[PDB]
Amino acid sequence: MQNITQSWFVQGMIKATTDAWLKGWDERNGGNLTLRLDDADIAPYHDNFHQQPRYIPLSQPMPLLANTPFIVTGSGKFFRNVQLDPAANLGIVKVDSDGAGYHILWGLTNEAVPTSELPAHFLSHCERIKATNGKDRVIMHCHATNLIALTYVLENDTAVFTRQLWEGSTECLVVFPDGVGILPWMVPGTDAIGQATAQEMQKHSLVLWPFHGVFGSGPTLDETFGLIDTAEKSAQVLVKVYSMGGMWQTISREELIALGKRFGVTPLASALSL
Amino acid sequence: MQNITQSWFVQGMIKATTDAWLKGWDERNGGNLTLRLDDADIAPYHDNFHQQPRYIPLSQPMPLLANTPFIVTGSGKFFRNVQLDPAANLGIVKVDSDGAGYHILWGLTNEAVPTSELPAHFLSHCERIKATNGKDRVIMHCHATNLIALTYVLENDTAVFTRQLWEGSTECLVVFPDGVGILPWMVPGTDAIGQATAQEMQKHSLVLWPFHGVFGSGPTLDETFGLIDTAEKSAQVLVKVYSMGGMWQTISREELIALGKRFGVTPLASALSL
Amino acid sequence: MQNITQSWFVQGMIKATTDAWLKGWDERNGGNLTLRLDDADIAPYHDNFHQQPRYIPLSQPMPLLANTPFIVTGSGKFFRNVQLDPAANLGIVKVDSDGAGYHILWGLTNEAVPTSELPAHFLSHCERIKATNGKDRVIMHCHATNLIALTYVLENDTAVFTRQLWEGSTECLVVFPDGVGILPWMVPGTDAIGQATAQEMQKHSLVLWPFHGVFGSGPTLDETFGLIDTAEKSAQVLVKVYSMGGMWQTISREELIALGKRFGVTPLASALSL
Amino acid sequence: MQNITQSWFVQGMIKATTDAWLKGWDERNGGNLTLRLDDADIAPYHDNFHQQPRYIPLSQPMPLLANTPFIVTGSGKFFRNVQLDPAANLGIVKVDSDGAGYHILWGLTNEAVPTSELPAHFLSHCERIKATNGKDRVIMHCHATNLIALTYVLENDTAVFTRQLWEGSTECLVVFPDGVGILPWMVPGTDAIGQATAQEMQKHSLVLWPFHGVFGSGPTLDETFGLIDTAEKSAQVLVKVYSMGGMWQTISREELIALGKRFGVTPLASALSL
Ligand SMILES: [Zn+2]
Ligand SMILES: [Zn+2]
Ligand SMILES: [Zn+2]
Ligand SMILES: [Zn+2]
Ligand SMILES: [Zn+2]
Ligand SMILES: [Zn+2]
Ligand SMILES: [Zn+2]
Ligand SMILES: [Zn+2]
Ligand SMILES: [Zn+2]
Ligand SMILES: [Zn+2]
Ligand SMILES: [Zn+2]
Ligand SMILES: [Zn+2]
């Protein structure tokens, strides 16, 4: 029999967290990742769940996530270490029948608990499930370096920020045609920042936390990591261009419109209008 | 018997795509690579081709590529993943007797198809075969970070851009004496951008897509990767120099002329004249 | 029986030094690391200590460290090489009953000796033991690139430097609420620089050596590495922002105060007052 | 019996070239490395030399290197590939009794030849042998990115350039107290550039080729790589500082003098006088 550590989802969590560590996006415990699973994903491994159950209440009831299993990163845990000890740094949790709390079925050994950003994660999963008819399955947060730097210089406005990111790499509009939501700075690890993030997730797959980092949503680990990597790559280009004194030329509005038409996407109107 | 995955060409595709991933040039699916093979390369592996054939028509007939096999990266596929599952992310294709389409002989599993930039690739192979009497065998596209940044600041002009790249690392003129072609921004994944790229490939081994990336051509995977790496290294130096306020000194015209003479190359006259 | 090289502490020293090498923080011999152990940590491995003893006097008596074992990096040794030959590059030392010197129990083969920055390390351990009621166990020095660059541009003042680092990544105030001490430039490898560093370690977990690097203290290798990585990440963001012409917006004083309250930390008053 | 590929010197060449590749210093074939061996180093492996000899004349007789064996990188070879096929990319050569040429005893398979920069290497070895009473054994050339960028902005003057590098990391004066020689731009791969480099090697362990790269000399692979890594790290810091608008404070002349005194080195007078 297959060890749960060799499962597609444990291996995928290891790959995404390790890749993000190597990118320089996740110093110390700066990042968190949650992946929504099906019962059918974890059923073959149920002898691993065979447990003195651990139950933890949610800060807010989440009835839409009733009975739903997730694999999640732990509070205070380092992305760098996930590859070294998956069961210490990751846990499989299942939200209970009423959405009032969850059991820790596997992992998060030695009294570890899920990420302190669980509200932002679970509330965003809720909104993304509604927004995508259940197709989005991943919420990823990291401290993407160039995106963070840009939050000190670009206006903290969805249209302006989205438009610069679209201009800074051709495929950006195709990968995130709904653009990038941006919050004011907020104290992290709170219900409030969770709820503010989730409200932006209704209309965007990416949300920026100024002076902090980024949240992304997608259907798979690779597509979510790739979404963030695309925005961060554009941010990296922009930081270089702005450091050289700014753009002498760029992708025009008309060109962005043509791009959207070709790829069958409706670009965020506010960003396109600039 | 040798598995096809251990072949020189599958191993080479893995090395080039993995190296480019590690460079930060190929976020998400941002990049594509095609390598022209001989019948003699794939003949020893023909039991791997033993197939429910898949046939796909080309958007434009390419009679010059009749009967020609290639190994290619897939549409929507991540350079990061090639090492993890070569058969999922790569395919061996063979253009048919008339050049009207190709069979997928191996790989591109689960209904995967070749890169969306196949026109730019195949049309460029055609022009490079003519330009080099059949010596060029590789077309590589990636999202080379500093080259991209420079397209927002340097004039989008072959002579000017070539000349700065030559100045930004001594060996540039020796590695690409024909210089760098540069298109206007165009909607990607089209016949039009393919044909525009191929027309520049007649007179240059490197072609820039502003605000997007670079295409390179060469006789081997290493020489093509190395060509791009050289241009991108010069671009990296230039981005640093421009960020520091610009050049106080540089390689002179006379010095570039002397360099060309020593290495027995005829540098692009327009770039040399500046 | 377990080889000492497979011990948690030898493996941890290898991980931290290798990670720091990969970060670009430790060119040549530029860095040093010391970890305070318990007798119980090394007792299971005592057959490895079975030795023609080597004894080296300390430059200054350190009675508070009497009888205390440490694992340490060697003088003139490369962080890059620790993974290749742990016993050549690391040593287990034990401070004697009076604190007048130490024995080299294991490692530092071929007449190697502990780091030339041993005074800064051991004196800082002393002050951190007092400051944290024995909870801090690690002193790490490296040449963190962006922190070094910032010492040429930011005022060399604890309040100003701390405040910018807090602003450059949200979690900074939470990770180092006591802020960052900063010395004037001093000749390294001396008792004087050791004593100056230790005096700052009384009131901060991080101390900057202008035009040189950083010292950090924490309870574990990961928490100490993570502390430095956090400060250096903020420094990296700031270098990008300053290169783009400076901040247009940032985390406010009020926001920093709110952050401190939420995380139950008392931020350094001088930095908070700006 | 030990394969020659497992020898200390083949393994060391692999480590240095691979490390330099990972640094981004050696795109394409941009770099070369030569290590002077003793007869006693290669004697245990002589059954590997058992050969249809290959002999190649030197461009200039080098009687001081008579009978001397070296391990060297090949012309047109990629540092990236050394780890994949050491015998293809490296060769063991022995200069003949008169210094008129050398035999290729091992490696450089498929008619490969030593680096095109052999004059710069061998002539520099000659001068460094004289300068250090035979202690220096390595000449390394690479395309160190930040050092290259600085050659477009700093005055191309030994005193000025040395002084900035000393200021940009404290240990620089200790690692290269003799400073950094700097040539005018010259056509590479020539006897002339070789002889110009060697003349600077009489009085410095580092020599800059503007708009091209750096040459370094030292007693071991690690000390030579570390020398270059130190200068390049300082260059990296300086590029960041200059990009942020320049130094507000720095290491003073008096401080550099104090540093030299403490470490028992005589710093280059011209650089110290600024
Ligand atoms: Zn965060
Ligand atoms: Zn069960
Ligand atoms: Zn919005
Ligand atoms: Zn592309
Ligand atoms: Zn067949
Ligand atoms: Zn052209
Ligand atoms: Zn140091
Ligand atoms: Zn004992
Ligand atoms: Zn203080
Ligand atoms: Zn070179
Ligand atoms: Zn023999
Ligand atoms: Zn000189």
Side-chain angles (χ1 to χ4, degrees):
Chain A
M1 137 97 78
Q2 40 185 38
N3 196 310
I4 193 162
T5 62
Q6 305 300 310
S7 64
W8 74 260
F9 49 92
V10 173
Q11 290 293 308
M13 292 289 288
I14 295 164
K15 192 186 95 184
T17 53
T18 303
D19 288 349
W21 162 250
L22 290 172
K23 289 291 196 187
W25 298 343
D26 297 283
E27 72 280 359
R28 198 185 178 264
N29 62 316
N32 22 79
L33 179 62
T34 60
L35 164 63
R36 175 168 60 91
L37 299 171
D38 290 337
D39 286 339
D41 291 318
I42 65 170
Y45 301 98
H46 85 102
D47 291 327
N48 287 284
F49 305 153
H50 275 159
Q51 335 201 184
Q52 177 150 227
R54 291 180 58 193
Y55 181 84
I56 302 176
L58 281 162
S59 60
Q60 174 193 159
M62 299 189 204
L64 183 65
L65 301 177
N67 316 307
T68 302
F70 290 83
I71 184 164
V72 307
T73 56
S75 182
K77 301 303 187 186
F78 289 44
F79 273 22
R80 191 261 176 275
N81 288 338
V82 172
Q83 64 189 307
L84 303 180
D85 195 342
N89 294 288
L90 305 177
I92 289 164
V93 304
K94 183 173 177 171
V95 178
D96 68 7
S97 73
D98 64 356
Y102 53 88
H103 289 90
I104 306 171
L105 298 180
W106 170 89
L108 296 165
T109 57
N110 296 310
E111 89 161 64
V113 298
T115 174
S116 60
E117 295 293 359
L118 204 64
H121 282 257
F122 278 3
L123 293 169
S124 293
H125 279 284
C126 281
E127 294 304 329
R128 296 301 298 179
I129 287 157
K130 291 185 281 180
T132 66
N133 195 216
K135 291 190 295 298
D136 275 8
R137 291 195 165 252
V138 180
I139 300 292
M140 179 176 168
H141 166 58
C142 58
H143 295 185
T145 313
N146 293 283
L147 283 165
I148 294 162
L150 288 185
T151 67
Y152 300 83
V153 305
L154 294 186
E155 183 188 355
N156 288 176
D157 174 78
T158 288
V160 168
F161 215 114
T162 294
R163 175 60 171 271
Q164 293 303 114
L165 290 174
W166 286 348
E167 290 181 21
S169 282
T170 289
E171 74 271 10
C172 284
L173 178 150
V174 181
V175 174
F176 49 97
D178 295 320
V180 181
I182 184 158
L183 298 186
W185 185 90
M186 297 178 68
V187 173
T190 59
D191 290 308
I193 202 173
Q195 296 161 204
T197 301
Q199 292 307 305
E200 287 291 343
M201 285 286 185
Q202 296 186 344
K203 289 282 165 60
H204 316 282
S205 67
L206 283 165
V207 181
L208 286 161
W209 284 10
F211 327 128
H212 184 157
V214 68
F215 271 72
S217 183
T220 64
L221 290 163
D222 278 345
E223 296 169 89
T224 307
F225 183 100
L227 170 65
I228 290 168
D229 205 17
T230 300
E232 170 61 12
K233 172 62 165 281
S234 180
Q236 185 185 8
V237 167
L238 292 169
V239 168
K240 289 173 178 293
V241 172
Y242 299 158
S243 297
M244 292 186 284
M247 296 168 180
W248 293 60
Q249 54 272 334
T250 194
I251 310 175
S252 78
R253 181 191 311 115
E254 292 66 37
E255 287 171 340
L256 290 168
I257 291 164
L259 184 64
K261 290 180 175 168
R262 172 66 180 181
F263 285 92
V265 298
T266 300
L268 183 68
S270 62
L272 208 59
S273 74
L274 306 176
Chain B
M1 137 97 78
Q2 40 185 38
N3 196 310
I4 193 162
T5 62
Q6 305 300 310
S7 64
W8 74 260
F9 49 92
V10 173
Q11 290 293 308
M13 292 289 288
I14 295 164
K15 192 186 95 184
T17 53
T18 303
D19 288 349
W21 162 250
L22 290 172
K23 289 291 196 187
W25 298 343
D26 297 283
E27 72 280 359
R28 198 185 178 264
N29 62 316
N32 22 79
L33 179 62
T34 60
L35 164 63
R36 175 168 60 91
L37 299 171
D38 290 337
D39 286 339
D41 291 318
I42 65 170
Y45 301 98
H46 85 102
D47 291 327
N48 287 284
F49 305 153
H50 275 159
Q51 335 201 184
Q52 177 150 227
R54 291 180 58 193
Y55 181 84
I56 302 176
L58 281 162
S59 60
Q60 174 193 159
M62 299 189 204
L64 183 65
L65 301 177
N67 316 307
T68 302
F70 290 83
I71 184 164
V72 307
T73 56
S75 182
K77 301 303 187 186
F78 289 44
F79 273 22
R80 191 261 176 275
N81 288 338
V82 172
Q83 64 189 307
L84 303 180
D85 195 342
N89 294 288
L90 305 177
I92 289 164
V93 304
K94 183 173 177 171
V95 178
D96 68 7
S97 73
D98 64 356
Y102 53 88
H103 289 90
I104 306 171
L105 298 180
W106 170 89
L108 296 165
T109 57
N110 296 310
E111 89 161 64
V113 298
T115 174
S116 60
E117 295 293 359
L118 204 64
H121 282 257
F122 278 3
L123 293 169
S124 293
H125 279 284
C126 281
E127 294 304 329
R128 296 301 298 179
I129 287 157
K130 291 185 281 180
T132 66
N133 195 216
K135 291 190 295 298
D136 275 8
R137 291 195 165 252
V138 180
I139 300 292
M140 179 176 168
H141 166 58
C142 58
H143 295 185
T145 313
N146 293 283
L147 283 165
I148 294 162
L150 288 185
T151 67
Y152 300 83
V153 305
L154 294 186
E155 183 188 355
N156 288 176
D157 174 78
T158 288
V160 168
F161 215 114
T162 294
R163 175 60 171 271
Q164 293 303 114
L165 290 174
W166 286 348
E167 290 181 21
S169 282
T170 289
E171 74 271 10
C172 284
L173 178 150
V174 181
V175 174
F176 49 97
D178 295 320
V180 181
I182 184 158
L183 298 186
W185 185 90
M186 297 178 68
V187 173
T190 59
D191 290 308
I193 202 173
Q195 296 161 204
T197 301
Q199 292 307 305
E200 287 291 343
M201 285 286 185
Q202 296 186 344
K203 289 282 165 60
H204 316 282
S205 67
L206 283 165
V207 181
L208 286 161
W209 284 10
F211 327 128
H212 184 157
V214 68
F215 271 72
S217 183
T220 64
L221 290 163
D222 278 345
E223 296 169 89
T224 307
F225 183 100
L227 170 65
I228 290 168
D229 205 17
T230 300
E232 170 61 12
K233 172 62 165 281
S234 180
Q236 185 185 8
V237 167
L238 292 169
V239 168
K240 289 173 178 293
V241 172
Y242 299 158
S243 297
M244 292 186 284
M247 296 168 180
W248 293 60
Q249 54 272 334
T250 194
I251 310 175
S252 78
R253 181 191 311 115
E254 292 66 37
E255 287 171 340
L256 290 168
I257 291 164
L259 184 64
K261 290 180 175 168
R262 172 66 180 181
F263 285 92
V265 298
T266 300
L268 183 68
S270 62
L272 208 59
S273 74
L274 306 176
Chain C
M1 137 97 78
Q2 40 185 38
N3 196 310
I4 193 162
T5 62
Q6 305 300 310
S7 64
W8 74 260
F9 49 92
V10 173
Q11 290 293 308
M13 292 289 288
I14 295 164
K15 192 186 95 184
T17 53
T18 303
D19 288 349
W21 162 250
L22 290 172
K23 289 291 196 187
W25 298 343
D26 297 283
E27 72 280 359
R28 198 185 178 264
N29 62 316
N32 22 79
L33 179 62
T34 60
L35 164 63
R36 175 168 60 91
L37 299 171
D38 290 337
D39 286 339
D41 291 318
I42 65 170
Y45 301 98
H46 85 102
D47 291 327
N48 287 284
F49 305 153
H50 275 159
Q51 335 201 184
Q52 177 150 227
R54 291 180 58 193
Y55 181 84
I56 302 176
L58 281 162
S59 60
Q60 174 193 159
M62 299 189 204
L64 183 65
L65 301 177
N67 316 307
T68 302
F70 290 83
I71 184 164
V72 307
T73 56
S75 182
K77 301 303 187 186
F78 289 44
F79 273 22
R80 191 261 176 275
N81 288 338
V82 172
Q83 64 189 307
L84 303 180
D85 195 342
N89 294 288
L90 305 177
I92 289 164
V93 304
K94 183 173 177 171
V95 178
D96 68 7
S97 73
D98 64 356
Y102 53 88
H103 289 90
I104 306 171
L105 298 180
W106 170 89
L108 296 165
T109 57
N110 296 310
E111 89 161 64
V113 298
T115 174
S116 60
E117 295 293 359
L118 204 64
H121 282 257
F122 278 3
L123 293 169
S124 293
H125 279 284
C126 281
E127 294 304 329
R128 296 301 298 179
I129 287 157
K130 291 185 281 180
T132 66
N133 195 216
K135 291 190 295 298
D136 275 8
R137 291 195 165 252
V138 180
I139 300 292
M140 179 176 168
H141 166 58
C142 58
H143 295 185
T145 313
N146 293 283
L147 283 165
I148 294 162
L150 288 185
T151 67
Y152 300 83
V153 305
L154 294 186
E155 183 188 355
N156 288 176
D157 174 78
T158 288
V160 168
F161 215 114
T162 294
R163 175 60 171 271
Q164 293 303 114
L165 290 174
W166 286 348
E167 290 181 21
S169 282
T170 289
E171 74 271 10
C172 284
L173 178 150
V174 181
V175 174
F176 49 97
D178 295 320
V180 181
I182 184 158
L183 298 186
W185 185 90
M186 297 178 68
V187 173
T190 59
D191 290 308
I193 202 173
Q195 296 161 204
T197 301
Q199 292 307 305
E200 287 291 343
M201 285 286 185
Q202 296 186 344
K203 289 282 165 60
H204 316 282
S205 67
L206 283 165
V207 181
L208 286 161
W209 284 10
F211 327 128
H212 184 157
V214 68
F215 271 72
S217 183
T220 64
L221 290 163
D222 278 345
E223 296 169 89
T224 307
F225 183 100
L227 170 65
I228 290 168
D229 205 17
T230 300
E232 170 61 12
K233 172 62 165 281
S234 180
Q236 185 185 8
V237 167
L238 292 169
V239 168
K240 289 173 178 293
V241 172
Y242 299 158
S243 297
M244 292 186 284
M247 296 168 180
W248 293 60
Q249 54 272 334
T250 194
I251 310 175
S252 78
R253 181 191 311 115
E254 292 66 37
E255 287 171 340
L256 290 168
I257 291 164
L259 184 64
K261 290 180 175 168
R262 172 66 180 181
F263 285 92
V265 298
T266 300
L268 183 68
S270 62
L272 208 59
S273 74
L274 306 176
Chain D
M1 137 97 78
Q2 40 185 38
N3 196 310
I4 193 162
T5 62
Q6 305 300 310
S7 64
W8 74 260
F9 49 92
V10 173
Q11 290 293 308
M13 292 289 288
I14 295 164
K15 192 186 95 184
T17 53
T18 303
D19 288 349
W21 162 250
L22 290 172
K23 289 291 196 187
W25 298 343
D26 297 283
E27 72 280 359
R28 198 185 178 264
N29 62 316
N32 22 79
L33 179 62
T34 60
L35 164 63
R36 175 168 60 91
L37 299 171
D38 290 337
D39 286 339
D41 291 318
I42 65 170
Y45 301 98
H46 85 102
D47 291 327
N48 287 284
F49 305 153
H50 275 159
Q51 335 201 184
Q52 177 150 227
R54 291 180 58 193
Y55 181 84
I56 302 176
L58 281 162
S59 60
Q60 174 193 159
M62 299 189 204
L64 183 65
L65 301 177
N67 316 307
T68 302
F70 290 83
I71 184 164
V72 307
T73 56
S75 182
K77 301 303 187 186
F78 289 44
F79 273 22
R80 191 261 176 275
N81 288 338
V82 172
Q83 64 189 307
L84 303 180
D85 195 342
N89 294 288
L90 305 177
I92 289 164
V93 304
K94 183 173 177 171
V95 178
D96 68 7
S97 73
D98 64 356
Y102 53 88
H103 289 90
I104 306 171
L105 298 180
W106 170 89
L108 296 165
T109 57
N110 296 310
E111 89 161 64
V113 298
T115 174
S116 60
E117 295 293 359
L118 204 64
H121 282 257
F122 278 3
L123 293 169
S124 293
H125 279 284
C126 281
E127 294 304 329
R128 296 301 298 179
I129 287 157
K130 291 185 281 180
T132 66
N133 195 216
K135 291 190 295 298
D136 275 8
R137 291 195 165 252
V138 180
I139 300 292
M140 179 176 168
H141 166 58
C142 58
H143 295 185
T145 313
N146 293 283
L147 283 165
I148 294 162
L150 288 185
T151 67
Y152 300 83
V153 305
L154 294 186
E155 183 188 355
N156 288 176
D157 174 78
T158 288
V160 168
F161 215 114
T162 294
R163 175 60 171 271
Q164 293 303 114
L165 290 174
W166 286 348
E167 290 181 21
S169 282
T170 289
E171 74 271 10
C172 284
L173 178 150
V174 181
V175 174
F176 49 97
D178 295 320
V180 181
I182 184 158
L183 298 186
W185 185 90
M186 297 178 68
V187 173
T190 59
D191 290 308
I193 202 173
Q195 296 161 204
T197 301
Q199 292 307 305
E200 287 291 343
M201 285 286 185
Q202 296 186 344
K203 289 282 165 60
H204 316 282
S205 67
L206 283 165
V207 181
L208 286 161
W209 284 10
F211 327 128
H212 184 157
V214 68
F215 271 72
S217 183
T220 64
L221 290 163
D222 278 345
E223 296 169 89
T224 307
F225 183 100
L227 170 65
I228 290 168
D229 205 17
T230 300
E232 170 61 12
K233 172 62 165 281
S234 180
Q236 185 185 8
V237 167
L238 292 169
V239 168
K240 289 173 178 293
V241 172
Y242 299 158
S243 297
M244 292 186 284
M247 296 168 180
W248 293 60
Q249 54 272 334
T250 194
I251 310 175
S252 78
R253 181 191 311 115
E254 292 66 37
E255 287 171 340
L256 290 168
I257 291 164
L259 184 64
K261 290 180 175 168
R262 172 66 180 181
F263 285 92
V265 298
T266 300
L268 183 68
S270 62
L272 208 59
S273 74
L274 306 176

